């Protein structure tokens, strides 16, 4: 017997989120078609939340890079539209606690303004990326005799060179290496290491962990800022300390 | 019977903020938050002046 309040508060949340994605689409069509005379900021910006918490702003880089996006649990009571759902579904970020590797360019970048209230962005370290891949990771795999929806964790390097002998990718240490590299092939690793899973960070219910939930909700309310301005700076957080928690 | 250092410093703030007049310092919000009585102000200031600053 659903509620009378959430049905209205979610409707306001849909109005806000759909309108900010509308304003994003307007301003990005103005930047992309270069019919620009009336915008706020010509170039985009990258904000950096680190430790009373400092936030460093650097102008955008016209250069491809590695990112490890982290699907966050979204904000409180929002029904999310179809444009954001299309971008998240092309990036496989439904069923949260899934941080996935992605490429920074200028054409992939306008998606990052749209997914930003639902994910977090940042630069991870190759030791942390290493520990992610060597501790976590599934492979959808075609094997000996299966109905074949099956995923194996990263054990066999010969299974790796079996499907990736064409690109010449062997020995998952090299998959870590060339996710770091992105000079020959990175999206092949997106096809191969296609699934990802992270743990839920708090034990959750119960007294000793509800305090932890409250403190970390205060931490998340500090670290995440919601812009809704369509000139939204990209917010990077250190994934390196973050994977001391989530891996 | 002398005066305490905080409240004589408070009187010293009042002595420089308003001067000597009492109707202005009576209706002062800042540094008269206890809203002292009209003449208690006079008594404490005269005691403070006899103690220090003529």
């Amino acid at each position: 017997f659903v509620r009378a309040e959430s049905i209205v508060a979610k409707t306001l949340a849909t109005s806000r989120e759909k309108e900010r994605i509308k304003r994003v689409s307007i301003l990005e069509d103005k930047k992309a078609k270069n019919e620009t005379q009336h915008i706020a900021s010509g170039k985009d910006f990258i904000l950096k939340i680190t430790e009373g918490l400092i936030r460093e702003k650097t102008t955008y880089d016209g250069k491809p890079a590695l990112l490890f996006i982290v699907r966050v649990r979204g904000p409180l009571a929002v029904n999310i539209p179809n444009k954001a759902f299309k971008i998240l579904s092309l990036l496989r970020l439904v069923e949260t606690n899934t941080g996935v590797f992605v490429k920074l360019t200028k054409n992939v970048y306008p998606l990052l303004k749209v997914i930003a209230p639902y994910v977090v962005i940042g630069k991870p370290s190759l030791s942390s990326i290493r520990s992610l891949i060597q501790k976590r990771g599934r492979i959808i795999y075609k094997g000996e005799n299966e109905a074949e929806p099956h995923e194996i964790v990263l054990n066999d390097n010969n299974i790796v060179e079996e499907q990736l002998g064409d690109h010449g990718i062997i020995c998952v240490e090299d998959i870590i290496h060339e996710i770091a590299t992105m000079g020959e092939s990175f999206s092949v690793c997106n096809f191969f290491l296609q699934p990802f899973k992270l743990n839920r960070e708090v034990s959750g219910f119960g007294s000793l962990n509800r305090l932890r939930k409250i403190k970390q909700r205060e931490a998340e309310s500090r670290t995440r800022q919601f812009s809704n301005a369509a000139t939204a700076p990209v917010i990077e957080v250190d994934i390196d300390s973050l994977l001391a928690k989530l891996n | 019977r002398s005066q305490s250092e905080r409240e004589e410093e408070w009187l010293e703030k009042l002595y420089k903020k308003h001067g000597d007049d009492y109707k202005k310092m009576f209706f002062d919000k800042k540094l008269n938050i206890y809203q002292q009585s009209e003449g208690d102000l006079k008594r404490r200031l005269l005691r403070w002046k006899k103690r220090n600053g003529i």
């Binding site: 017997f1 659903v2 009378a4 309040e5 049905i7 209205v8 508060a9 409707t11 306001l12 | -």
Partner: protein, 133 residues
């Protein structure tokens, strides 16, 4: 006696007929649902009308919502009497502007400007305090 048609006042912002349907369907199936909206901009006038399959279900729904505090201001629901019917509501959108060309050519309306200027001068005479221009 009372009908199944229902008046609801004091609606919160962004709370529309879809949400009215999705909520009041849980009371029972409803016949019709409308919101009083504004013409230039399709915004709520904060009152609307419900209709149910039953009058008894309408009264049950009206009881649990008549002094209902909700999202700020409280709500007030009243069933209508048996002699009451729904009339004249429409989901108005935001009506955007239209631009249509001036029909007269530029020299006809130059002449219209010249006529209206002299005419306003004649009005400044007619009102009238002196104005040589």
């Amino acid at each position: 006696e009372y009908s199944g048609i229902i008046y609801v006042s004091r609606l919160p912002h962004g709370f529309h007929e879809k949400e009215l349907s999705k909520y009041f369907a849980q009371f029972g199936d409803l016949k019709e649902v409308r919101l009083a909206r504004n013409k230039k901009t399709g915004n709520s006038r904060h009152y609307g009308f419900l209709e149910f399959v039953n009058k008894e279900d309408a009264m049950i729904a009206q009881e649990s919502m008549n002094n209902y505090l909700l999202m700020g201001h409280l709500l007030q629901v009243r069933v209508l009497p048996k002699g009451a019917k729904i009339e004249k509501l429409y989901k108005y959108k935001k009506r955007v502007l239209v631009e249509k060309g001036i029909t007269k050519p530029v020299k006809q309306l130059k002449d219209n400007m010249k006529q209206k200027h002299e005419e306003r001068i004649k009005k400044l005479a007619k009102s009238g305090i002196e104005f040589k221009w």
